[PDB]
Design a protein around this nucleic acid. Structure first.
Ligand SMILES: Nc1ncnc2c1ncn2[C@H]1C[C@H](O)[C@@H](COP(=O)(O)OP(=O)(O)OP(=O)(O)O)O1
Ligand SMILES: [Ca+2]
Length: 266
DNA sequence: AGCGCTACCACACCCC
DNA sequence: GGGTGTGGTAGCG
């Protein structure tokens, strides 16, 4: 109830074919529309013209969004809005300052990370998976090894992203102590000891840069790594790039009549 | 007309 | 000197 109260105060304080394309200034007004929609619609965040994080919000289906998005001539700097309390996938934001840590073997650190989380998923939930179920994206530059991992688990999902964070803090506590998970620590922008895993992305209504999208500032967009081992099922009725787009979406959990929802309280 | 939060610091408090 | 909650903005994500 504590969350539903903060929104109520912010509110008072503030022919053609079957298409759906609604832009909203307030994230709250967007989700309100989704409820009164009657169509499998979702919420996207577009970075406004301002160089800061000022964002506007779009509401449309995945298919209709990919239609006006695939060319990459329009709708640049888009983000997925991960709805609070909604079932989602296991994902990661991986990033360290390249020059600050030279000896870091990026492609080797991710494999060690995945094999750990995989083992963790088995010991704690009986879930079995391998890197073959891990969509691997890249947005790196000459100064930042940036990677996004989206797990594609078979009939499995988390209660929400808040529980994903709890899962990681639990299994990454041995590394957090280091103010064998030695390969996680990395020197930050100013010599400080941060964690190769960004644990600040597991919040309510988190934005997450979409596939083939770059921040309003730079121009490097997310793309599938070369060592990626997740390959969707080829379907003649939709393009392959659309498959990766659907997979990459954190909050687009495969409909399954045997879905195991995973929880984890802190 | 973004949104969410925590890391950080100040203070106040308590205890033999 | 240690140890434990409480505000409250400032800045990351
Ligand atoms: N000002 C911001 N406002 C709202 N959401 C943000 C903001 N900054 C970051 N986020 C969200 C969207 C981002 O996809 C998510 C992770 O932070 P961030 O690392 O900066 O983006 P990114 O991982 O997609 O690119 P990269 O890390 O390589 O710079 O947090
Ligand atoms: Ca990042």
């Amino acid at each position: 109830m504590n969350r539903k109260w903060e929104a109520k105060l912010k509110q008072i304080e503030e022919e053609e074919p079957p298409s759906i394309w609604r832009l909203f200034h307030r994230q709250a007004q967007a989700f309100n529309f989704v409820k009164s929609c009657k169509e499998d619609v979702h919420v996207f965040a577009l970075e406004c013209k301002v160089g800061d994080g000022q964002r506007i919000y779009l509401v449309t289906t995945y298919a209709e969004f990919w239609f006006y998005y695939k060319s990459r001539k329009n709708l640049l700097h888009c983000y997925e809005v991960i709805p609070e309390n909604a079932v989602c996938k296991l994902y990661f934001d991986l990033e360290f300052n390249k020059p600050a840590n030279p000896g870091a073997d990026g492609k080797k650190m991710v494999a060690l990370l995945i094999e750990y989380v995989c083992k963790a998923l088995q010991e704690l939930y009986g879930v079995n998976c391998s890197a073959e179920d891990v969509l691997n994206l890249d947005s790196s530059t000459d100064e930042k090894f940036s990677r996004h991992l989206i797990f594609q688990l078979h009939d499995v999902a988390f209660k929400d992203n808040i529980h994903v964070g709890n899962f990681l803090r639990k299994i990454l506590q041995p590394a957090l102590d280091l103010l064998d998970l030695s390969f996680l620590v990395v020197k930050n922008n100013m010599g400080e000891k941060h964690l190769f895993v960004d644990l600040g992305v597991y919040t309510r209504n988190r934005n997450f840069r979409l596939y083939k999208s770059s921040k309003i500032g730079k121009r490097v967009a997310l793309e599938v790594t070369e060592d990626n081992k997740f390959f969707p099922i080829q379907s003649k009725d939709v393009s392959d790039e659309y498959q990766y787009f659907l997979s990459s979406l954190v909050s687009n959990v495969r409909f399954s009549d045997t879905l195991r929802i995973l929880t984890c309280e802190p």
